[PDB]
Write a protein that binds this ligand. Sequence first.
Ligand SMILES: *[C@@H]1O[C@H](CO)[C@@H](O)[C@H](O)[C@H]1NC(C)=O
Lengths: 49, 39
Amino acid sequence: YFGGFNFSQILPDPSKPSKRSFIEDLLFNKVTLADAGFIKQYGDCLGDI
Amino acid sequence: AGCLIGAEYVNNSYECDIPIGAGICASYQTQSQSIIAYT
Ligand SMILES: *[C@@H]1O[C@H](CO)[C@@H](O)[C@H](O)[C@H]1NC(C)=O
């Protein structure tokens, strides 16, 4: 209770494993990443799919 | 960010001394002096 102001859309929600808010989820899903090799990808490159 | 050979992983948390990768750092500590890796 913050005097009638609700910050529920900008405060984090602990249900999902990444503690991220609703607006931050919208901002993350809106920008389509290049899916670069910040996580390792030589296993995906060696396996010819 | 790849993988480490020669540094053991401890279940603690300190300030980042040597930056390695996605939230993982390394340091030279005592608890015999050795290189440890942590978050
Ligand atoms: C604030 O917003 C959430 C979701 O939009 C809602 O559940 C909550 O009741 C709102 N707060 C108030 C005081 O109405």
